[PDB]
Antibody
Framework: EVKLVESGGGLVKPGGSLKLSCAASGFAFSTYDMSWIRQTPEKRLEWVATISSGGSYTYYPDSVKGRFTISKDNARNTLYLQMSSLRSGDTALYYC????????????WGQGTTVTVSSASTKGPSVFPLAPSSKSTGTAALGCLVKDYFPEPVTVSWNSGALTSGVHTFPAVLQSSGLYSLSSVVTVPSSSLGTQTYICNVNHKPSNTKVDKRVEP | VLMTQTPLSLPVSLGDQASISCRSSQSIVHSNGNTFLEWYLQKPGQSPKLLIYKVSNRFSGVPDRFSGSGSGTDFTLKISRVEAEDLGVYYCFQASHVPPTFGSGTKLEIKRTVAAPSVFIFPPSDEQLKSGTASVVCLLNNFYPREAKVQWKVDNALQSGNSQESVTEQDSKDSTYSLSSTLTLSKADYEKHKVYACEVTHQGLSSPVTKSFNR
């Protein structure tokens, strides 16, 4: 089955550099042209680079030309975007994509990796529980408050991915301090409360922060 | 080649038809005959996924509910018998002339019946206090429409400038939204007061619901 899996994103200083990687599987990689597309914070989609199957031609838009290099490793079926002299405007989610030749369409997409170009240092979040009570009550709601981090993203799962129904992980909010915070909540049967275990699994890769908070009444 | 979409957002009821339009700056015929115009849908939390290419060609797997048409400058996608799983952002896209470009997107929104939120409050955690700050969380769960008003009160004094709010994208199982609002205070300010209230105004409540707790 056809897949693209991206890695390498993270926080970098203005005028720094960073290389993205995109591991392909399931198809004859070196027989397709491949691209990178970025999605800005306003959700605009922009084409950033394309490389022919031969590796012979490379195509970039004017905003990126001279700074970004798309390349590929054919033994390992991996796609790369070397990004250098990064600017503030380069911050975005970056996707790799397979550009089918007959139709010229993008038919498989990566999951995305996010790049944040900023002068500020990373800061790892604090993780605080949102305990179920008679005040969050036959369903009770509990949660996790992931406070004061930079940059995005933070991911949250519950019971290591075992719990998903009634899970709401909210978009990050900006604090006045310029740091983000987010909530992740879940509703459950209140009868389960005494008996079943509820933990949030929180990762912030840029600060190598990995926390599990058991949330109890 | 600017691609411009309308409407920017499109409420539609289940079973109904949705129509989205895409206009290009210049013509998007590639001097090969074909015109490389394409429609993508990006569902919440997912990558964009290909629906239509070369104007009217369904990409494999794409239900027969989706169709494309249009000529040279003007393109339409139509979605008949809209299902809840169809909500998200639809994008048009042009690889006829270089650089390839995308329109700015149209949000498909599922119209359903009003639903008042389930409102819960969470006091600060002892853990957070020990560190110097106090966050009070207010959750409005699974409501419709997206508009909700949340007022924070500390000993009945309306609060301003000291809270943040976000709302989830529309949910596919039941077409509702959820909202979290956080009131952030000093340990000190938190300690001086008694009554922490979150009061919610919404289209599905005849009058406001206040959930409170006493420190």
């Amino acid at each position: 089955e056809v897949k693209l899996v991206e890695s390498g994103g993270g926080l970098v200083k203005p005028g720094g550099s960073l290389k993205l990687s995109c591991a392909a599987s399931g198809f004859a990689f070196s027989t397709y042209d491949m691209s990178w597309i970025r999605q800005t914070p306003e959700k605009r989609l922009e084409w950033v680079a394309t490389i022919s199957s031969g590796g012979s031609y490379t195509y970039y838009p004017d905003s990126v030309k001279g700074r970004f290099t798309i390349s590929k490793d054919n033994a390992r079926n991996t796609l790369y975007l070397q990004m250098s002299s990064l600017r503030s405007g380069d911050t975005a989610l970056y996707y790799c994509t397979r550009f089918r030749y007959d139709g010229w369409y993008f038919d498989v997409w990566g999951q995305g990796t996010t790049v944040t170009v900023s002068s500020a240092s990373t800061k790892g979040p604090s993780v605080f529980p949102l305990a179920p009570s008679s005040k969050s009550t036959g369903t009770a709601a509990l949660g996790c408050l992931v406070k004061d981090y930079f940059p995005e993203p933070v991911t949250v799962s519950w019971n290591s991915g075992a719990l998903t129904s009634g899970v709401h992980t909210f978009p990050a909010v900006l604090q006045s301090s310029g740091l983000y915070s987010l909530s992740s909540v879940v509703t459950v049967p209140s009868s389960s409360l005494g008996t079943q275990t509820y933990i949030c699994n929180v990762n912030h890769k840029p600060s190598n922060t990995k926390v599990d908070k058991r949330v109890e009444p | 080649v600017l691609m411009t979409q309308t409407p920017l957002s499109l409420p539609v009821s289940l079973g109904d038809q949705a129509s989205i339009s895409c206009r290009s700056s210049q013509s998007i015929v590639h001097s090969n005959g074909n015109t490389f115009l394409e429609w993508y849908l990006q569902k919440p939390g997912q990558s964009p996924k290909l629906l239509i290419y070369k104007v009217s060609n369904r990409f494999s797997g794409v239900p027969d509910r989706f169709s494309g048409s249009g000529s040279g400058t003007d393109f339409t996608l139509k979605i008949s018998r809209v299902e809840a799983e169809d909500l998200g952002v639809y994008y048009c896209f042009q690889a006829s002339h270089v650089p390839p470009t995308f329109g700015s997107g149209t949000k498909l929104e599922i119209k359903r019946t009003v639903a008042a939120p389930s409102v819960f409050i969470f006091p600060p955690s002892d853990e957070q206090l020990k560190s110097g700050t106090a966050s009070v969380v207010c959750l409005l769960n699974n409501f419709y429409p997206r508009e909700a008003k949340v007022q924070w009160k500390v000993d009945n004094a309306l609060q301003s400038g000291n809270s943040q709010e976000s709302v989830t994208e529309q949910d596919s199982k039941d077409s509702t939204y959820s909202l979290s609002s956080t009131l952030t205070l000093s340990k000190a300010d938190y300690e001086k007061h008694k009554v922490y209230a979150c009061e919610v105004t919404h289209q599905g409540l005849s009058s406001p619901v206040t959930k409170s707790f006493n420190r």
